[PDB]
Amino acid sequence: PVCLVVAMTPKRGIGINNGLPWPHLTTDFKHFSRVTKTTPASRFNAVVMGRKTWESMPRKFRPLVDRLNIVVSSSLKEEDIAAEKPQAEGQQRVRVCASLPAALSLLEEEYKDSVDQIFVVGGAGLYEAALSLGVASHLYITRVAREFPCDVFFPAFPGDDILSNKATYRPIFISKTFSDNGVPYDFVVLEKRRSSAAAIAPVLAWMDEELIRAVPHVHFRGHEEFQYLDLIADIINNGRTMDDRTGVGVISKFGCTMRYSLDQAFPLLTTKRVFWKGVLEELLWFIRGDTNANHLSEKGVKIWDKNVTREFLDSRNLPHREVGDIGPGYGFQWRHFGAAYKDMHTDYTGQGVDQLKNVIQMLRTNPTDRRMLMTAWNPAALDEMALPPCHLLCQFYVNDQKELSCIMYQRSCDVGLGVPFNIASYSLLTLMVAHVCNLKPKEFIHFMGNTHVYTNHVEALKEQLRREPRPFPIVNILNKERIKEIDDFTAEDFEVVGYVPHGRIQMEMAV
Amino acid sequence: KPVCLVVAMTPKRGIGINNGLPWPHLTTDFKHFSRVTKTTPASRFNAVVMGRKTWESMPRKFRPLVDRLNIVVSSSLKEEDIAAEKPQAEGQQRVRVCASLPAALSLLEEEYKDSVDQIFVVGGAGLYEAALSLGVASHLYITRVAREFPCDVFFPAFPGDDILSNKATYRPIFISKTFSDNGVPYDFVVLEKRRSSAAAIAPVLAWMDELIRAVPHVHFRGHEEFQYLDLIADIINNGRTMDDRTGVGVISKFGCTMRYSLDQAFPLLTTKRVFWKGVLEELLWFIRGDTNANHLSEKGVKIWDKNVTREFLDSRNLPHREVGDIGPGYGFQWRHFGAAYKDMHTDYTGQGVDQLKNVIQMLRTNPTDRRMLMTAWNPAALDEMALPPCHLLCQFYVNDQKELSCIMYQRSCDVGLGVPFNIASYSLLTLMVAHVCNLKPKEFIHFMGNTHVYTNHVEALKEQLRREPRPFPIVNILNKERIKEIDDFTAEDFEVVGYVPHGRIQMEMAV
Numbered sequence A: 001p002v003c004l005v006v007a008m009t010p011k012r013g014i015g016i017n018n019g020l021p022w023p024h025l026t027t028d029f030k031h032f033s034r035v036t037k038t039t040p041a042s043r044f045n046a047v048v049m050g051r052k053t054w055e056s057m058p059r060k061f062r063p064l065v066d067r068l069n070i071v072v073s074s075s076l077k078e079e080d081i082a083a084e085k086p087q088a089e090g091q092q093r094v095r096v097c098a099s100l101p102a103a104l105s106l107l108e109e110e111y112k113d114s115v116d117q118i119f120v121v122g123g124a125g126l127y128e129a130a131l132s133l134g135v136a137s138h139l140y141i142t143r144v145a146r147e148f149p150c151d152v153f154f155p156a157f158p159g160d161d162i163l164s165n166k167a168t169y170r171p172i173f174i175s176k177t178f179s180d181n182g183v184p185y186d187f188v189v190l191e192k193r194r195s196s197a198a199a200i201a202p203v204l205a206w207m208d209e210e211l212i213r214a215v216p217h218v219h220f221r222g223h224e225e226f227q228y229l230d231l232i233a234d235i236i237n238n239g240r241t242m243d244d245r246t247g248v249g250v251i252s253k254f255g256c257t258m259r260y261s262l263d264q265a266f267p268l269l270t271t272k273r274v275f276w277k278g279v280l281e282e283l284l285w286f287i288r289g290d291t292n293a294n295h296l297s298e299k300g301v302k303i304w305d306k307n308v309t310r311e312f313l314d315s316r317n318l319p320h321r322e323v324g325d326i327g328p329g330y331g332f333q334w335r336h337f338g339a340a341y342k343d344m345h346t347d348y349t350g351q352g353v354d355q356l357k358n359v360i361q362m363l364r365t366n367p368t369d370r371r372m373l374m375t376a377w378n379p380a381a382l383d384e385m386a387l388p389p390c391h392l393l394c395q396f397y398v399n400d401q402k403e404l405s406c407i408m409y410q411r412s413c414d415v416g417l418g419v420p421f422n423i424a425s426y427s428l429l430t431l432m433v434a435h436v437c438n439l440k441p442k443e444f445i446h447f448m449g450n451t452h453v454y455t456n457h458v459e460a461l462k463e464q465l466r467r468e469p470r471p472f473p474i475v476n477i478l479n480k481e482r483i484k485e486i487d488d489f490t491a492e493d494f495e496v497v498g499y500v501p502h503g504r505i506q507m508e509m510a511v
Numbered sequence B: 001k002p003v004c005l006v007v008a009m010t011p012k013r014g015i016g017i018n019n020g021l022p023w024p025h026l027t028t029d030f031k032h033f034s035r036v037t038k039t040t041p042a043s044r045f046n047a048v049v050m051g052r053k054t055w056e057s058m059p060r061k062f063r064p065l066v067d068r069l070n071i072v073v074s075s076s077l078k079e080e081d082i083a084a085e086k087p088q089a090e091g092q093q094r095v096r097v098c099a100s101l102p103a104a105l106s107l108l109e110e111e112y113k114d115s116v117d118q119i120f121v122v123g124g125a126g127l128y129e130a131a132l133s134l135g136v137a138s139h140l141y142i143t144r145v146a147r148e149f150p151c152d153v154f155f156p157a158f159p160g161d162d163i164l165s166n167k168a169t170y171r172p173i174f175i176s177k178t179f180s181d182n183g184v185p186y187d188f189v190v191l192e193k194r195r196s197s198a199a200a201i202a203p204v205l206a207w208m209d210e211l212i213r214a215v216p217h218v219h220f221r222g223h224e225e226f227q228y229l230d231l232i233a234d235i236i237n238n239g240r241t242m243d244d245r246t247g248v249g250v251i252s253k254f255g256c257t258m259r260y261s262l263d264q265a266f267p268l269l270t271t272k273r274v275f276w277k278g279v280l281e282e283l284l285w286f287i288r289g290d291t292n293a294n295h296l297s298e299k300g301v302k303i304w305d306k307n308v309t310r311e312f313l314d315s316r317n318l319p320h321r322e323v324g325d326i327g328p329g330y331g332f333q334w335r336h337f338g339a340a341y342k343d344m345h346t347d348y349t350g351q352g353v354d355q356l357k358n359v360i361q362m363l364r365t366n367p368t369d370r371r372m373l374m375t376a377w378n379p380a381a382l383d384e385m386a387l388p389p390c391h392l393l394c395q396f397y398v399n400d401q402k403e404l405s406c407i408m409y410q411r412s413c414d415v416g417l418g419v420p421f422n423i424a425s426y427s428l429l430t431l432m433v434a435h436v437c438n439l440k441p442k443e444f445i446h447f448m449g450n451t452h453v454y455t456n457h458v459e460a461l462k463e464q465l466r467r468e469p470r471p472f473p474i475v476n477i478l479n480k481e482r483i484k485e486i487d488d489f490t491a492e493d494f495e496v497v498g499y500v501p502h503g504r505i506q507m508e509m510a511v
Ligand SMILES: NC(=O)C1=CN([C@@H]2O[C@H](COP(=O)(O)OP(=O)(O)OC[C@H]3O[C@@H](n4cnc5c(N)ncnc54)[C@H](OP(=O)(O)O)[C@@H]3O)[C@@H](O)[C@H]2O)C=CC1
Pocket: A005, A006, A007, A008, A014, A015, A016, A017, A018, A019, A020, A021, A049, A050, A051, A052, A053, A054, A056, A072, A073, A074, A075, A076, A098, A099, A100, A121, A122, A123, A124, A125, A126, A129, A152
């Protein structure tokens, strides 16, 4: 019973020029060391590596301390390694075998009392052999989210859908996303499948007195996307069927919550492709205080079009509004709160309260202040808007370490469509604010009021819950030196790195 | 050998009056009793031991207790007196009579070994007194009836009866959430006499894996107050030390959530005495749109006085404000959002947005609407206020069963002083609205931004965490027929029932 341990690109790449394809990944190395070393006294673990993998290792690190090193080789000899460096006291000598079956034979013959676990450590020669013999019970795979130039690859395997889009290996463990040197990655483990409380017990039994799961097989759910996935499952299982303004049936819950880290990776949901071009353009649109939807529409972002049509503006009793005008919508209240609205063509400079500017100035001068808020909800202007703001409020917070966190409150949440878009939107805002204020992005916290999935999304979401999430990508602000104020950001100042989502799922917008 | 006591008790230890139960029927308690006394893992049954009067107080259709060996402690009653009282049913045990409790336990050893599993002392005072004297009681199943009733028979005094009211040991290991039947709140406690299937995943868990706890011995933490208590412990252990507007030190966290049920009982925190007169008078003050703090101060509610002094108004750069004038604060924005403020003496009827009326009218006509929000945050009027609103937004929600839920977002939360007050303040509003909209109150959900404990509260809070909570009280709206609109409520239309909190703890307000 052997296990495989690997770091791997989305296209199964593992090595180039007898070396690692990516810059150093410190956390992955700490992970490798820990898994391969840890034992419950009398026993040590066995690491089996190929010749080239042995050679790729720096001479300082080889042999891997506290582990029985085994090199599969025809050309190298046991003395070549013995003469490479003097053997340190209290360590087992490196054994060389012709093949992997021979390497396992040696473990049975000589070492059956000494070793607890066996690890195949690389490279492509040993992984392929181990997969051929079917001796692999588990696969410890570090999923490098970025693609790098490679000449050596891990062989394709039934269940390699965890890496990219296309006896079996099913994920049983998925971690949160880490990143080092601008390279996002996470850790998965795949399994070969094919009277202390006795007094309390009867009281609990009477009390309890009375279906849909996300990726049920995955037992450790470290990935932060599971929040969203369990949140879907939760509303489908425990929500209530309600009527709606849209006329479409809704299954709803009230007062749900999610929070996402921004220090390592970006919470751009991987279980379905997120229209990032849309989130970026809408946020930049918001920041300008622009209320003209045709500016978004001309850029290929048609997210507001169905709610600024002649027919919708008239159902909203605003026949004087031009097609496209969202009225005093989100952006207008951010930059000109309480200002008298005319149309989308009017210059509103200096008018109203510039909430965004006040939030930033307070962050840069007095970050312990507890009044760092930005609201889009204006009861006086609600009837003039094409649609009342969903995401209506956000608060900022700075800790000891100059780390910035953002809460956002949403009155109404379309889980299937709007939420993944809203997560990414305010998470992006946090990065942008964090940079302009000289702060580290830490956390985005999502507070939700009426949390609902539309009936016509249910089947499509059930499909989405069979999908095990991929590592979160990294969003980089480019041209950091040029950007000094929040208005300095443009569409091209952003780069989404290592985003490998599952395919797009069609979900109609409830008009 | 060891026995378990099962009781339903008044705060003053009362268990009975006129050879009967002091309170109206509590179905859930009667269920609890039935299940704990009956449940067994085949061949065995449990034994219930009672006094002569406890047997007599019991209805005839219920005695003997089915599927349980009944033992009566008596000197006058004989075994044939009971047998002639009712024909023994097939399968059931014959009721035994013993001259004492030690004689009862001796019979359980002599004739009923291999027959009985668990022994339960079931009353009354005579038997409870003896079982505590002998020291054979390993566990006490106590149903804490929060309401005081006329009683002539009492449960004996015991070390650790501090769980009932204010003043070898019996410490709580289980505290449930508050239930209520027939307007009588109660909960359940259990005391204790003290004086490679998944293992191939654990190594990766090991390296990813990592001081103050409230009532740590209590293992089952059903009581919803534990939310508040664990939130205190969480801030102290994991929070970050920041500076603050007031100058007083602060330990803080960001993005905290609590929720409290409103259907059974009221979340008026029991682990310290909450100034309820203050929560009621301030809320009615809000409802009136009153900005004059002297109207609260005349009634003995001085919660606002330290922020309306000549000194604080001037430090806010408001020299023209009369002493008491909070400016356009919560009350004002609720009933007159956007209205141009003059002073506290001006009549603003018909001016600005009446958010409260809009919320109620929407609830009564279109409850599936997702825009039922009320906000106090008005960035245009913030500088004119004496203090920017802490609790700045609340949203309402109605479901299938005409049940009302309410979320309140609070930008800044003084956990020691303000939080308990705010929980009661909006939970009371939810009651008030629910009645006026013909809806059942369901849940209050607390969303918290900058959640902090002041450094001069830390010692007093550590003391508070040693206290286990008491059952929640019921808040009754009196004169229901008279009250039809939200403005109809008065200070006299409310009744707190069964409130038994711990002693007040002095906590200075950071000015
Ligand atoms: N990211 C990751 O997880 C890891 C990546 N790597 C990378 O992979 C590369 C090294 O792997 P790779 O190039 O495949 O070389 P290997 O480590 O597979 O070793 C190849 C040599 O070992 C012997 N050998 C290997 N497999 C067998 C077999 N089944 N039977 C008999 N002999 C065998 C052969 O010797 P002979 O020719 O004499 O028969 C062969 O020349 C490096 O670039 C390294 O950086 C390495 C480890 C982990």
